[PDB]
Amino acid sequence: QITTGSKELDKLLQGGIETGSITEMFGEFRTGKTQICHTLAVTCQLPIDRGGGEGKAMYIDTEGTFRPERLLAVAERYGLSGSDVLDNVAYARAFNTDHQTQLLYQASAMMVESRYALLIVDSATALYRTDYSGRGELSARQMHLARFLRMLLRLADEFGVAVVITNQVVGNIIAHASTTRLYLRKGRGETRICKIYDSPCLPEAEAMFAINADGVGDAKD
Amino acid sequence: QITTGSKELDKLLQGGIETGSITEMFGEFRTGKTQICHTLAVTCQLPIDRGGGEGKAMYIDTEGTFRPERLLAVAERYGLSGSDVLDNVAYARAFNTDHQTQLLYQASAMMVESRYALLIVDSATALYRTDYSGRGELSARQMHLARFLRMLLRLADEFGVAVVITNQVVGNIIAHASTTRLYLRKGRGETRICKIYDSPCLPEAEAMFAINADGVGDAKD
Amino acid sequence: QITTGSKELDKLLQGGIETGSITEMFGEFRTGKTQICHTLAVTCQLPIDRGGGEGKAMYIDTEGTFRPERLLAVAERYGLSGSDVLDNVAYARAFNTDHQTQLLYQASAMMVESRYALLIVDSATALYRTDYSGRGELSARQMHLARFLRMLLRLADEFGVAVVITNQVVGNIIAHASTTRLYLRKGRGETRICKIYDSPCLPEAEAMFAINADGVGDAKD
DNA sequence: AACGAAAACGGCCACCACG
DNA sequence: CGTGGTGGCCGTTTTCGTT
């Protein structure tokens, strides 16, 4: 179980993400999906006794929001070497849906030589909206997304890593494929509300957390 | 954190601009955007213990409002050599959007040899309105602005400098790219109201400041 | 330095308009722009020791407000021959922006044979609003105005004359081109407030003056 | 049975009044 | 001065009548 670094969120998840499965967090923009991704990108490298996976991180960005400085802040919060964190995070920006899936081909071969624990795909659904904008081409983007999700599941079962994808809510296919769906909504200021909206094992429940300069971290009224 | 030279504004920002990120100040004309730019162009050279960055300044002007005498006034206010301030400020007027972006090519190579802390682009959006005035050419100016903003972010991450751009409100793309949005409005006389309209870390809040011959400086009723 | 004929205004300008440069006075209607123009049209002919330029005047009118009788009043105030004043003032009404610029072609050749000291363009911006009223044609009037301003600067540098243009405030291009911007506002009765709103050499400052039958002349409470 | 014309209804725009 | 509501005009659709 990879620690989220929010204790309340860890309790909500019973200790953190299950490696080897896809966890989807759907919420409005600015809810902190990207911030949680940046935090996990570092916490994954933490020792297992500290809630990490003792593995490198993979950040596939489609939205430009990748900040190595956020990774440095998370590393210094938990006392990890920021330089080693950036050395254990491989980053690449996907320009389109086809490029987004093509990066998985390099990811599968690269993930064999080194132990990874986390795969991050940020604005995973944005490129299927910007690229495929027509109505007759909807089935094509749905097929590409389906294949992409199957590839995610395959890599998860192959390397035993956690698969994190982010969705902006301004597909029903992900429900059966994703094991845990988390709904994120803004509480005013920088403090966010998290809700579980389906889990066969986890209750439907809510937990409050905040977005702090160091971290994605528990709410401290 | 580069001191704004207004204490109330510094408190509003928790001490001043974060270097390495873009801070956008949108407000009506005559609200003092240019005055704040002139003040920061000198305060950046202040010692870090005094709220500066101990670096040279870069002023890219598109509106003709550049005044070295204002820089001299700010330098004498804080006791900086006005001649050295003008020697540590490189100035160039952009004639068009293409020239505005082209100046960044000289800026990137020139910013490598000397330490800079502040990049100022005044009336940054005016040239996209004067040059691109048609309606079919809107996407072209939006693309050029997008590339310009990406170049700003790249230079910010490369040199760890503060990126300041000014917008006259007589684009939605800047929101995700800009980290702190400040709304400026006139209070009658020479005293201006500043409001924070988005920050993931800073509260939505307001602070009152004035525009004084020496300085951009706190309101003194 | 051509005397304004208001002593307080002369002090505000450090003695009067610099010949060879454009001085813009922007203010509300009825603030006295036209009255100041009529006064200067005569004072320019005054001896240099009296604050004149010892040159003829040029009045390009676009608004119908040209009054030779006002010129006669200014001439008799300072003791100048009203008939010779009208003989040293060449007048022409511009019917459109194209005609307004076309008159400059006759002005350049005519200004070579005789010494002039003042060029007056009254409601200089009105024809760009009445002629070019659409929104798609804004760039065309802006280009025509830009060329007109460049022609003004060229004539100023060629003949060393003062260039006076009047703007009704019910363009940002003029700022870099105009050397001294004066804001005019009404004080009730016939007494007007003048403010300097940009000058690299002149302070931002204000001076009170009145509009008297003889003259544009100092306020006398 | 098909086409054309007339009438009615709905939506959009402009003007006036009130806050 | 700005926003909201009401009224009027225009356009489109449907129905009826005539060829």
Author numbering:
A (entry chain M), B (entry chain K), C (entry chain L): 101 to 270, 289 to 339
What does the paper say about this structure?
RAD51 is the central eukaryotic recombinase required for meiotic recombination and mitotic repair of double-strand DNA breaks (DSBs). Here we report the cryo-electron microscopy structures of human RAD51–nucleosome complexes, in which RAD51 forms ring and filament conformations. We found that RAD51 forms multiple conformations in the complex with the nucleosome, such as ring forms with eight (octameric), nine (nonameric) or ten (decameric) protomers, and a filament form. Notably, we found that in all RAD51–nucleosome complexes, the NLDs of RAD51 directly bind to the DNA wrapped in the nucleosome.
